[PDB]
Design a protein around this ligand. Structure first.
Ligand code: ATP
Ligand code: MG
Ligand code: ZN
Ligand code: ZN
Ligand code: ZN
Lengths: 259, 257, 591
């Protein structure tokens, strides 16, 4: 297993692929055919189906959503390469599980759920325009025009500070359009009000739809969102690498359930 | 001499520059004209009668006699104009211990619609109708602030939280520039009857300085010669507005002639 | 000193496309386009994307993929192509304007993946900023070493030189700008939004800012619908970024023969039947208005408004109205809003709104400071959005004085010239207007003149072609029948409607009928003259008198009723019915 997890790549894949084929209300194969017809490369799944089929896999899913989901896609794509083995798709199928652990007491959420999937009912309040976030930054020396690229430099970008051809001083400046970007939509959502017992201070959270699943919820819509709880440091200053001991937290959405 | 690679570059060369300056300095006395009156010497006396520091030069005279200087003049507006201004100042101080030169009789007259980016940063003449004017504004000054605790300079700030590090310090002026150290702004449009059918009349702005302070009134038709060129404006970084630096202004008497 | 061989290869093949590819005749069309481009105020060269795909499919696909990367090379190849061909002025900017791209995307489809690559899109303009010169090739010089840092291209922000051109000096912070030497180009910011057709119901459109340059600067105007070819691009803003679509070419958003050929056989047969169908007049009104009882003259007038007469431009350049303006004054309830809603629901280009609308646009174009930039922007109102369309305005009695005068200017002129704060512009708006109002004191006093019944100014009364009065009759039979219609609608949740012609078939017929331009037969001319003699002889007493404006509405109505049957000439049948509608519309003072 990968370190720190009870997760085997092959065994979990076969268990998931078994769940896709073998199931009782087999619908996953039917919507796969619908996906093969339509071409929509996503497979939204009620996680409680996996719980009923395999509580351990469901438990394994909740513990390691980020680790386990790529295996789930791998299992589904091979199934798509089995049934309708030849086809055309701009990208292969994906999976967006949901409705797993109704920890709808958003005002009661602990750091124990960090990096574990959770589903919550609430009303989106505010949104924003899609943020094109760099993933590979094209660069080129000012002096001799020596082009180059830096690819996924851990969020920040590493300034070359020296050319590659002439090897002059800091001359490799980023090229915006030539660089590679991905869409990222920020959303702020409030706790569902009727679910709050006291409601003395309604709880609010942030969301991030990355590269896809963007603008699918307009403001004010009461939906059940399922995604990966996340916490990240905050630099005390952008200039300095020091960070706070506290950790601002957000959700990277995996699935939206309109309601 | 002439026949370089670019006229702006060629006049920028010191050799041809001082050659042209001496040739125009020669022209500031030798141009006695067919009348044989030392026309420049008359104007120097006339200007020094009241110290008006503004000479009227016919482009025909430069084209006829100097030719090369006049031909480079639209291609080298600022450079040759300062060559004329410095030459005239020397003659004024010699004869009558700054002097500005205004070029007139430009062969080609244009319309506001007619002018385009091809004529950008060039002297050109046109006839329009003044739509509005203002006062002689004191000064336009652009300020750029070196950041407090980072290697950054903030952009120009027109006058009349560093984006790199967000330093809250007061910052230090890395560089400052002043332009139009005393100036009146006006607007001119296409004259009535010259409108291109249902098109709205075009409009342009003319900036005038002590060379042409308050030379007109709003609502008048005038023939103006000036440098159709780009410049900043009072507004992240300040916008670049294309204007006509008024070099020579002529009225249109009676509005119909 | 680094060359992109893909760009060199693309430039060469594109230059080959300019100087070898040719029309069906076998002549280099682009030489002729370049020959026309030598004129002043002519720098953008049109290019057909399908043509260069035929010349080299790889070249078109590579250009499509790397459009922003290769585009400067295209301009450079255009410069080489055009400079030697003729006595072009030595250095004026030149641009390549693309077209013939099938990949027309919705605004929802734009992504980071689409940055740089070319694409076509279509939307509706919202607000247009003033034109502004923008530096493209910055020319700088360090203050210390005084070496000219030449041609530092700025990525749409105040990007100073990174370091001195002199390797010895590293001042790094005091690069003074050369005003004249720096290259410039005029850019205009414009906001566009999703068209209503693409827009899902109740969904907020994806607003998009775009940049317009060269001839594209003034190509489109505020509030109009247009198609744009170009590419999306990030722009840094206060490592933040935001997207803007730079459109190289701007085109409008989409003849009887071409329509009928493009029209499918079944659609052609139905429309052909519909044109042949006599009594389509009443049948269409019944189908268009299922949940309506009586008041068919209103249904008649609206249908004529939907068709509208042929516009005419005189030899003096004076435009003459093709569409019309119709108003309704009715007691409380009485389906006026229902009339407008059905019209808006059926018709694309039909926009609903209210005179109580407190928008800063005021239903029309407005000049307003940018919320962020603080510059004034010509923000289009819903009337401008309905250009060559219809506006279903509610609360027309309760309009504002500012809207009232501006609207009066618009219908009088068919255009609006807006000028304030130095900014000035004019916009065409040939839009049918459906005014909905209620009588003063709620109920219509038929014993009092229409001027007493409504607050609208006389010029508003004059410029409106028709006025329909709705009154709450005590007649129980109408009251019973309306209740029967309503309750059947509610009880028979669907199927209560009786659409003898489907709304798409109705719309298709109107589109094809709109392709026609019916003319006035000399028979109809004297017939129209004879009708107005009766109207003039009638001389009201009418709530309003009879000027030439009544005749102008009559001829426009007759053209519409000629358009109803798709006949290329007007007949007396159209005229007499038009006289019947207007003459019946004249409500005499019942004192
Ligand atoms: N003559 C009529 N025939 C059929 N239905 C009618 C008629 N008059 C009114 N109705 C019904 O009246 C209902 C309510 O009227 P509605 O709300 O449309 O009025 P309105 O024209 O907006 O009124 P107002 O603007 O004066 O307040 C509508 O659903 C319509 O069905
Ligand atoms: Mg109503
Ligand atoms: Zn280099
Ligand atoms: Zn700083
Ligand atoms: Zn230096």
């Amino acid at each position: 297993v990968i370190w720190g997890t009870d997760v085997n790549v092959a065994a979990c894949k076969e268990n998931f692929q078994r769940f896709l084929q073998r199931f009782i209300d087999p619908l996953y194969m039917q919507r796969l055919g619908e996906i093969n017809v339509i071409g929509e490369p996503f497979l939204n799944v009620n996680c409680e189906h996996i719980k009923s089929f395999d509580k351990n896999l469901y438990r394994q899913l909740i513990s390691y959503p980020q680790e386990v989901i790529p295996t789930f896609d791998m299992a589904v794509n091979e199934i798509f390469f089995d049934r309708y083995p030849d086809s055309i798709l701009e990208h292969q199928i994906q999976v967006r599980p949901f409705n797993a652990l109704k920890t709808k007491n958003m005002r009661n959420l602990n750091p124990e759920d960090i990096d574990q999937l959770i589903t919550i009912s609430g009303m989106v309040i505010r949104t924003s325009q899609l943020i094109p976030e760099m993933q590979e930054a094209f660069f080129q020396c000012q002096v001799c025009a020596h082009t180059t690229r830096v690819e996924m430099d851990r969020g920040r970008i590493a300034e070359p500070s020296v050319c590659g051809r002439c090897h002059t001083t800091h001359s490799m400046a980023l090229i915006h359009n030539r660089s590679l970007f991905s869409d990222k939509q920020m959303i702020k959502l409030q706790e569902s009000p009727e679910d709050m017992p006291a409601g003395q201070t309604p709880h609010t959270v942030i969301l991030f739809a990355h590269n896809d699943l963007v603008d699918k919820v307009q403001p004010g819509d009461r939906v059940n969102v399922t995604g990966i709880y996340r916490a990240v440091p905050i630099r005390v200053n952008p200039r300095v690498s020091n960070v706070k001991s506290v950790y601002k937290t957000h959700i990277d959405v995996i699935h939206y359930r309109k309601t | 001499d002439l026949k370089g690679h670019s006229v702006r570059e060629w006049v920028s060369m010191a050799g041809p520059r001082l050659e042209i300056h001496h040739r125009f300095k020669n022209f500031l006395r030798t141009h006695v004209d067919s009348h044989g009156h030392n026309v420049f010497k008359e104007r120097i006396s006339d200007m020094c009668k009241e110290n008006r520091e503004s000479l009227v030069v016919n482009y025909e005279d430069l084209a006829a006699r100097e030719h090369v200087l006049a031909y480079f003049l639209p291609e080298a507006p600022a450079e040759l104009l300062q060559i004329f201004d410095e030459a005239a100042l020397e003659v004024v101080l010699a004869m009558y211990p700054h002097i500005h030169v205004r070029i007139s009789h430009l062969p080609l007259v244009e319309e506001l619609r007619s002018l385009r980016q091809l004529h950008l940063n060039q002297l050109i003449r046109t006839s329009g109708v003044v739509t509005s004017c203002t006062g002689v504004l004191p000064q336009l000054s652009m300020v750029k602030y070196n950041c407090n605790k980072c290697n950054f300079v903030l952009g120009p700030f027109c006058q009349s939280s560093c984006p790199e590090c967000q330093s809250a310090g007061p910052f230090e002026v890395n560089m400052e520039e002043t332009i139009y150290q005393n100036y009146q702004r006006i607007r001119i449009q296409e004259s009535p009857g010259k409108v291109a059918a249902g098109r709205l009349p075009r409009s342009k702005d003319a900036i005038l300085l002590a060379d042409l302070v308050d030379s007109c009134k709003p609502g008048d038709e005038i023939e103006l010669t000036g440098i159709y060129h780009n410049n900043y404006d009072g507004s992240g970084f300040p916008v670049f507005a294309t204007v006509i630096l008024a070099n020579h202004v002529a009225k249109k008497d009676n509005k119909v002639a | 000193e680094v060359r992109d061989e893909v760009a060199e290869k693309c430039q060469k093949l594109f230059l080959d496309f300019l100087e070898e590819f040719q029309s069906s005749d076998g002549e280099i069309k682009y030489l002729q386009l370049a020959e026309e481009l030598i004129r002043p105020e002519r720098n953008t060269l049109v290019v057909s994307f399908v043509d260069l795909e035929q010349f080299n499919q790889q070249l078109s696909t590579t250009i499509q993929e790397e459009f922003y990367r290769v585009y400067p090379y295209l301009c450079r190849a255009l410069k080489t192509f055009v400079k030697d061909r003729k006595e072009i002025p030595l250095a004026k900017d030149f641009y390549v304007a693309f077209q013939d791209l099938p990949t027309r995307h919705k605004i929802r489809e734009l992504t980071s993946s689409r940055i740089g690559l070319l694409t076509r899109i279509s939307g509706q303009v919202v607000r247009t900023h003033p034109v502004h010169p923008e530096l493209v090739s910055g020319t700088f010089l360090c203050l210390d070493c005084q070496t000219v840092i030449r041609d530092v291209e700025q990525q749409f922000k105040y990007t100073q030189p990174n370091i001195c051109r002199n390797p010895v000096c590293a001042n790094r912070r005091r690069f003074l700008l050369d005003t004249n030497k720096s290259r410039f180009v005029d850019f205009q910011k414009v906001r566009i939004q999703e068209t209503q057709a693409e827009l899902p119901r109740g969904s907020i459109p994806r607003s998009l800012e775009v940049i317009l340059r060269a001839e594209a600067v003034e190509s489109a105007q505020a509030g109009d619908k247009c198609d744009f070819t170009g590419t999306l691009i990030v722009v840094p803003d206060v490592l933040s970024y935001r997207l803007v679509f730079l459109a190289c070419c701007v085109a409008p958003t989409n003849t009887a023969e071409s329509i009928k050929n493009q029209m499918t056989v079944k659609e052609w047969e139905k429309v052909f039947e519909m044109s042949q169908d006599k009594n389509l007049y009443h049948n269409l009104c019944t189908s268009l208005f299922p949940t309506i009882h009586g008041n068919d003259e209103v249904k008649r007038g609206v249908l004529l408004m939907l068709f509208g007469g042929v516009p005419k431009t005189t030899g003096e350049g004076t435009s003459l109205r093709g569409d019309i303006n119709v108003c309704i004054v009715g007691d409380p309830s009485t389906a006026k809003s229902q009339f407008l809603k059905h019209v808006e629901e059926f018709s694309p280009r039909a926009v609903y709104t209210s005179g109580k609308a407190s928008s800063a646009a005021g239903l029309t174009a407005a000049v307003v400071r940018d919320e962020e930039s603080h510059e004034f922007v010509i923000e289009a109102g819903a009337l401008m959005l309905a250009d060559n369309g219809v506006c279903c305005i509610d609360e027309f009695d309760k309009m504002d004085v500012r809207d009232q005068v501006a609207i009066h200017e618009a219908m009088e002129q068919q255009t609006i010239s807006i000028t304030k704060a130095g900014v000035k512009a004019t916009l065409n708006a040939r839009t049918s207007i459906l005014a909905a109002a209620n009588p003063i004191s709620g109920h219509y006093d038929r014993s009092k003149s229409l001027k007493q019944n409504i607050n609208l100014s006389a010029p508003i009364m004059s410029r409106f072609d028709l006025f329909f009065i709705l009154v709450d009759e005590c007649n129980e039979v109408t009251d019973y029948a309306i209740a029967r219609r309503i309750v059947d609608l509610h009880s028979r949740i669907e199927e209560s409607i009786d659409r003898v012609y489907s709304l798409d078939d109705i719309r298709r017929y109107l589109l094809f009928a709109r392709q026609f331009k019916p003319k006035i037969s000399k028979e109809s001319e004297d017939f129209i003259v004879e009708q107005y003699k009766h109207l003039r002889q009638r001389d009201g007493k009418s709530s309003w008198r009879i000027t030439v404006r009544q005749l102008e509405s009559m001829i426009r109505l007759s053209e519409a009723m000629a358009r109803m049957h798709c006949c290329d000439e007007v007949q007396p049948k159209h005229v007499k019915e038009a006289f019947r509608l207007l003459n019946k519309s004249i409500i005499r003072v019942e004192t």
